[PDB]
Amino acid sequence: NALQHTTIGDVLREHRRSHPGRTALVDGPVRLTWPELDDRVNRLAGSLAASGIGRGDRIMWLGQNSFRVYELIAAAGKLGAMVCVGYWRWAPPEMEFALRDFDPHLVVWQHQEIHETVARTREALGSDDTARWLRHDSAPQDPDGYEAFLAAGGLADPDLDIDPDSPVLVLYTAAMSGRQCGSLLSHTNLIAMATAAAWLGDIDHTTAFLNSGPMFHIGNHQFWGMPTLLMAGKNVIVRRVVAEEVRDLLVAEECTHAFLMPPTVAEIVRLNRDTGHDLSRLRATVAPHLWEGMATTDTSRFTRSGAAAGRGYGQTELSGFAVTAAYGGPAAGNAGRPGPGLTVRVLDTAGRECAVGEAGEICARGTVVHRGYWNRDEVNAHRFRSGWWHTTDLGRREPDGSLTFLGTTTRMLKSAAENIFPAEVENCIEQHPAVREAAVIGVPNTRWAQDVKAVVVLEPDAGVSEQEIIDHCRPRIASYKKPKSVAFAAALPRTVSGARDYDALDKEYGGGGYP
Amino acid sequence: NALQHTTIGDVLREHRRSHPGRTALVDGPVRLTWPELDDRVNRLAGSLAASGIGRGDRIMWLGQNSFRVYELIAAAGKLGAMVCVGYWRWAPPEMEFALRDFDPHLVVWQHQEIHETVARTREALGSDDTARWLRHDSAPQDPDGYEAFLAAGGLADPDLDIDPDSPVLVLYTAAMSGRQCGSLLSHTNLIAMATAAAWLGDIDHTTAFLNSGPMFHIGNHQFWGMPTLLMAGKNVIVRRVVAEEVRDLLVAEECTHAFLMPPTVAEIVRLNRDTGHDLSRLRATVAPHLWEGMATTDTSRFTRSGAAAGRGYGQTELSGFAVTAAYGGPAAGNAGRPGPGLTVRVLDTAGRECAVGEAGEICARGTVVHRGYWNRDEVNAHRFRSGWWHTTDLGRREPDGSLTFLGTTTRMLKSAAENIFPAEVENCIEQHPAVREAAVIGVPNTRWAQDVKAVVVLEPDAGVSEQEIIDHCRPRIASYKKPKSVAFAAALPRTVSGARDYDALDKEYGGGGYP
């Protein structure tokens, strides 16, 4: 006779009763209290259901940040449906791929800034374009607009018994290979994530969070959109980051938190200097020194532990930053320890647990593990093999029990019989105090496929030779993993997106012979 | 392909890897680190499985507090079995009832203080006594002892795929009628409860909790045994409360928390005064003023909100104190608002939602709701009707959205066509500033079954008449709910257990004619 666990719908139904006059969401001139939000969600759900959307059905969002993203997630959630929050910077080929892959019943799109890509993509789909398209930033009466579609639904709550293990949020992720896959996050995934984040950040109903991170990425949901929603705080939306509008919203909405990277913080600070505008309610998590005393430094566990400075490990498929230095105290390893909804093992290629200090694939079980990728039957079977989710990230356990994240398992060398993970070698070299960064590649060898080569970037105030790098590796890693040679560079090549460009390293330094 | 949620077994498996040298449990001379505890749990699980215990099977604990209670819960949990932590003060009739009801495969019992009751109870069971009995506080080699049974198991983890919705902890509760029923708490119930409690109390791996509350009751598990376990802190066991031993453990184990009622606090303080023993690490939640500066006042949300002083509502069946003033800010209602794993509605007799201010039965859905009572098919069907758990507690929602707990729904008057809940009338009278407490009973009326009568206890420094009590009620409650007469008393009659004695009020004041 026992009932379901809590769903995202239950959260809104509770907030509308417990917090009748509190502001849930702000987006430009739109201000919605909990009951006004839940009413809109019910009307939206009514219209979605009238259009044939039910359990397991799919809605794709192709816009920037909006309060409507939260409405759509809640409304789909009340029907047991799911929303993909798409990457609004997709070019037409990638947008077409995602539309065909996800196969949505409904697409909610944005005109501003992306109408050209959208038009190109619909042209490409041709006779396969059978979804309903609704323009979110339309005139309010536009019959092909979101608001008109929503207004046509009734106030009644659908009141269905939705299983919270159902996917509700789908976020596309890219492998190093460039292959993209939609990670299925359930109600339970999001609630467990949000509950842990509320402990990490000391979040409560007085939190006012600026949704200045992209909602197509897990970061903004974890820190701090979903915990703010869960604890009945106020979510303030900005479409994307424009420093002046951000500053204005921080002040006008009295924000306590925001998702801001250091270059944005510096921009905000420069334009606020000697204006007298009060940013002191903002709890500075990232780059506290950059704020020049204008914000208050965060004293939550998130900041105190170093997690805010990157001391942790996670991925979309673990509902975000699931391992951190805020769990379990001081840590020799760079990532800390798993939080409450997760257990982690480091597994070798044979699926056996690695010894302390031995590098292997980070694998996980627990409430924060995603439900799999959408439409990836073979990949899912492989990646959930033996009842563990395989992250494709390489790590090790330290003697104190903490974890170190080394890099990906998807780069591998094979030198004669020996599999070698460059990430392990890179991390070893990067411990040398003269080294700022190191990239490891494989170069062809006619007798045993590949030799190991390191491309090393020194700190400006340091010097070290090829031989000294090689000897540094001797006591730390297996002999066959050491670089045969070392090239020095001023900096590594990087992609337009800021990631390491291994194709470029391979082209420059004679890389080849990979498995 | 997606996996299970987190189980209690996963918690111990993670802690043994992440916290290899930290102390998990202390009980007299026993000190167990996380790996030593998980090893014992694996040996215990091996022996339990060898004896035929598997999914859905049942172990009854008839002892006082022990580290072995945590071991048994974990070991049963790894098999998908459940442990009833019995009321060690049961007299033989109640002990026999519980044994026959719960029908355990194994009974782990305690000689000290209760051997006579146990012997009487086994005599009564006669030829129906077919369970294995293991003495927990035996000589270590006793072949009918717990330690010998455990030592015979192997170190291998059973490594089963246990559904965490499975009951793992069973706690007996008593209705006002005196009927006793075992509430089924799942792994998920306990973990969700523990996660919320860790936010409430700011619990982490440095917490050191003294298990000085009874483990047969939900209080000690919620505040703070289970969150301490979840966050990898140290649980220190005391068999029962003896002020001097408690004081010694608080100091020697450097406890940060304990489950202590005010009379016990005052006893500890009296015996610590001018000894110089340092109690300053203890975070005083209850009765902070009674500590005379010897402990540090708790600054967590639990204390700051008033929850620690009783501003909240819960029951075993909601995994404890599930509604509190720490959730959602200031509250007009005495109980506050529901925490994250719960939604609450106040429902009238017809199952429709009550208006703001109208008294009705507190009903719940969500992750913290129990799985039902053991062996109560008809009661469970009735109490989970319409997909809500019915608490049998009477409450109302206030205009600000908070909740007030009024009393039980199991006391009811029926005066002609009108159902009247005395708890509603009592709460109304108790708002009068002259009134310390009020009890309401029904007295026979030959024309319409019952009239309402109030028994009122005044504050010592106040005076108020019968008529003034009646007129106080006029604008606050329906006319037919007002007392027809008021008797004044120096204090209410109470049972040996400290609860109100309505049988005694009925006998003294002419009560009768109940539905």
Ligand SMILES: C[C@@]12CCC[C@@](C)(C(=O)O)[C@H]1C[C@@H](O)[C@@]13C[C@@H](CC[C@@H]21)[C@](C)(O)C3
């Ligand atoms: C602003 C960011 C982050 C938020 C999401 C984006 C999409 C946005 O425009 O709203 C984003 C834009 C990025 O080009 C940028 C800009 C700058 C700072 C962070 C991000 C950096 C490091 O060069 C990357």
Ligand SMILES: C[C@@]12CCC[C@@](C)(C(=O)O)[C@H]1C[C@@H](O)[C@@]13C[C@@H](CC[C@@H]21)[C@](C)(O)C3
């Ligand atoms: C987004 C995180 C978490 C998940 C895994 C990552 C790889 C990712 O990009 O998906 C990750 C990236 C981290 O730089 C970051 C960014 C921000 C917020 C969380 C994480 C914080 C605190 O500075 C750490």
Ligand SMILES: C[C@@]12CCC[C@@](C)(C(=O)O)[C@H]1C[C@@H](O)[C@@]13C[C@@H](CC[C@@H]21)[C@](C)(O)C3
């Ligand atoms: C915006 C992201 C994600 C999408 C693809 C990228 C390439 C991009 O610029 O569009 C990417 C850029 C990343 O520096 C960033 C920026 C910020 C937020 C997410 C990503 C974070 C966590 O620091 C990582």
Ligand SMILES: C[C@@]12CCC[C@@](C)(C(=O)O)[C@H]1C[C@@H](O)[C@@]13C[C@@H](CC[C@@H]21)[C@](C)(O)C3
């Ligand atoms: C100590 C308590 C609470 C813990 C569990 C008990 C069983 C125990 O002995 O360990 C318990 C004993 C109760 O008679 C008592 C004693 C005193 C203070 C609280 C409890 C009060 C109010 O008169 C009730």
Ligand SMILES: C[C@@]12CCC[C@@](C)(C(=O)O)[C@H]1C[C@@H](O)[C@@]13C[C@@H](CC[C@@H]21)[C@](C)(O)C3
């Ligand atoms: C045990 C609680 C919670 C559940 C429902 C109750 C009725 C019960 O006895 O079962 C409840 C009793 C409360 O006096 C108490 C006791 C202690 C700890 C929690 C609750 C605290 C903080 O002083 C509040």
Ligand SMILES: C[C@@]12CCC[C@@](C)(C(=O)O)[C@H]1C[C@@H](O)[C@@]13C[C@@H](CC[C@@H]21)[C@](C)(O)C3
């Ligand atoms: C010990 C309890 C529970 C069992 C039955 C009782 C009668 C008893 O004395 O044995 C009971 C006594 C309650 O005052 C108490 C004491 C403490 C802890 C639980 C119960 C709490 C929460 O303050 C309520």
Ligand SMILES: [Cl-]
């Ligand atoms: Cl739902």
Ligand SMILES: [Cl-]
């Ligand atoms: Cl398990």
